[PDB]
């Protein structure tokens, strides 16, 4: 029987139901934009469970026994079976508010509030936003507009690997024992991504050395002429705090959101200016919390949400990116690997490429 939890399902990139899930993902995204959190969650859980199927839905009978498929979702599936299209998702794709929110938030530095502001000012195109002489932009948005075309072309694996080399070269210059791991979508087997994320940890670094690494690495890149954008968020990590109770848990580790200059010569692929702007995120965590951070930063977002929901509701455990706490035993559970976290939770291990929920 298919579990309602993504953490009890294997979700690989061979999606046989893309016709259904692309429509459900559009409807979920629109509900996010329309601030309808409930309808958003229902469409996300339905899309997620269909992504896990080893076969394509070809009739309504095929949906029997599948959880997270409410009556509204079943009407959408029925419509796609009928003529290969979702009339509901088609209407969202042609909606002016939806088109504007997608287009405006595609700019690095633009969120829901700024996209809503620009829409209510009557803006519909990025050309009209950029050329407006009254608008004031944040430093993040200026970088978002300046490197727009590069950031909107999604990063491929040769580029992600070339970025990994740059990150490792910079990091070991200051911490030679540091462990650097590529996380996010690329770790889950994806061919492309909007950014490249890394988890950095050191078994022998001090609390101060751990704090200074992201500043040293970004200053080195600034000197090199490779740092196009940099925002370092200092740690708010608390060694003895209980893990988050929130639906979507916040990460308190030291991190940085960057834009790097990636020279074409560094990319070893099959194939203008000779460089590409790449979004890069670096996370530094204490060595003892590396398994929890890796598990949280690997994703997918739906896999993480269901992991934390399963931990709470089924095991009376509290899980987040920093720790795992057992409310019955009144102890924090230690882990040196993701496999140990899954074993603590009573879950069969799900490989990173199986977490595409
Ligand atoms: N501030 C944050 N706190 C905790 N976890 C975060 C986070 N930002 C990102 N993540 C997590 O790390 C994974 C990577 O984040 P993102 O790069 O934003 C999406 P992705 O899974 O890598 O596909 P994508 O890079 O093409 O968008 C997420 O899927 C999520 O699990
Ligand atoms: Mg990512
Ligand atoms: Na954005
Ligand atoms: Zn990221």
UniProtKB/Swiss-Prot annotation:
Changing residue 22 to A: Almost complete loss of exonuclease activity in TDT-L. Decreased transferase activity in TDT-S. Its cofactor is Mg(2+). Residues 3-357 are annotated as: Mediates interaction with DNTTIP2. Keywords: Cytoplasm, Hydrolase, Magnesium, Metal-binding, Nucleotidyltransferase, Nucleus, Phosphoprotein, Terminal addition, Transferase. One of its GO terms (biological process) is response to ATP. Mg(2+) binds at residues 195, 197, 281. Transmembrane segments: none annotated. Isoform TDT-L: Expressed in the thymus, and, at lower levels, in the bone marrow. Detected in both cycling and noncycling pro-B and pre-B cells (at protein level). Isoform TDT-S: Expressed in both cycling and noncycling pro-B, but not pre-B, cells (at protein level). Not detected in mature peripheral or germinal center B cells. A 2'-deoxyribonucleoside 5'-triphosphate binds at residues 185-190, 194-197, 296-297. Changing residue 251 to A: Nearly abolishes enzyme activity. It catalyses: DNA(n) + a 2'-deoxyribonucleoside 5'-triphosphate = DNA(n+1) + diphosphate. Its EC number is 2.7.7.31, 3.1.11.-. The keyword Chaperone does not apply. GO terms for molecular function: DNA binding; DNA nucleotidylexotransferase activity; DNA-directed DNA polymerase activity; hydrolase activity; metal ion binding. GO terms for cellular component: cytosol; euchromatin; nuclear matrix; nucleoplasm; nucleus. Residues 110-114 are annotated as: Involved in DNA binding. Can also utilize other divalent cations, such as Mn(2+) and Co(2+) (in vitro). The keyword Nucleotidyltransferase applies. Belongs to the DNA polymerase type-X family. Interacts with PRP19 and DNTTIP1. Forms a ternary complex with DNTTIP2 and core histone. Released from this complex by PCNA. Interacts with TRERF1. This is DNA nucleotidylexotransferase. The lineage of its organism: Eukaryota, Metazoa, Chordata, Craniata, Vertebrata. The chain holds residues 149 to 510 of 510 of the full protein.
């Amino acid at each position: 029987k298919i579990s309602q939890y993504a953490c009890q399902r294997r979700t690989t990139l061979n999606n046989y139901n893309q016709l259904f899930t692309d429509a459900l993902d559009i409807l979920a995204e629109n509900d996010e934009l329309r601030e309808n959190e409930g309808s958003c969650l229902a469409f996300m859980r339905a899309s997620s469970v269909l992504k896990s199927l080893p076969f394509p839905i070809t009739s309504m009978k095929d949906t029997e026994g599948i959880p997270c498929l409410g009556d509204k979702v079943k009407s959408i599936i029925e419509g796609i079976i009928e003529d290969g299209e979702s009339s509901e998702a088609k209407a969202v794709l042609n909606d002016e508010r939806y088109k504007s929110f997608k287009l405006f938030t595609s700019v690095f530095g633009v969120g829901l509030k700024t996209a809503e502001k620009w829409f209510r000012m009557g803006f519909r195109t990025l050309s009209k936003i950029q050329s407006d002489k009254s608008l004031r932009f944040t430093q993040m948005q200026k970088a978002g507009f300046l490197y727009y075309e590069d950031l909107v072309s999604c990063v491929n694996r040769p580029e992600a690997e070339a970025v990994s080399m740059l990150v490792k070269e910079a990091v070991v210059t200051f911490l030679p024992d540091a462990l650097v791991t590529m996380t996010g979508g690329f770790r889950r087997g994806k061919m492309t991504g909007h950014d490249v994320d890394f988890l950095i940890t050191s078994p022998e670094a001090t609390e101060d050395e751990e704090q200074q690494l992201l500043h040293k690495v970004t200053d080195f890149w600034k000197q090199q002429g490779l740092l196009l954008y940099c925002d370092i968020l200092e740690s708010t990590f608390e060694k003895f705090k209980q893990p988050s109770r929130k639906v979507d848990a916040l990460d308190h580790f030291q991190k940085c959101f960057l834009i790097l200059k990636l020279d074409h010569g560094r990319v070893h692929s099959e194939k203008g200016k000779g460089w590409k702007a790449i979004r890069v995120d670096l996370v530094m965590c204490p060595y003892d919390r590396r398994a929890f951070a890796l598990l949280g930063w690997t994703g997918s977002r739906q896999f993480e949400r269901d992991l934390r929901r399963y931990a709470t509701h089924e095991r009376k455990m509290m899980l987040d990116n920093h720790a795992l706490y057992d409310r019955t035993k009144r102890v924090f559970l230690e882990a040196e690997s993701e496999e140990e976290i899954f074993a603590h939770l009573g879950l069969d291990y799900i490989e990173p490429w199986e977490r595409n929920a």
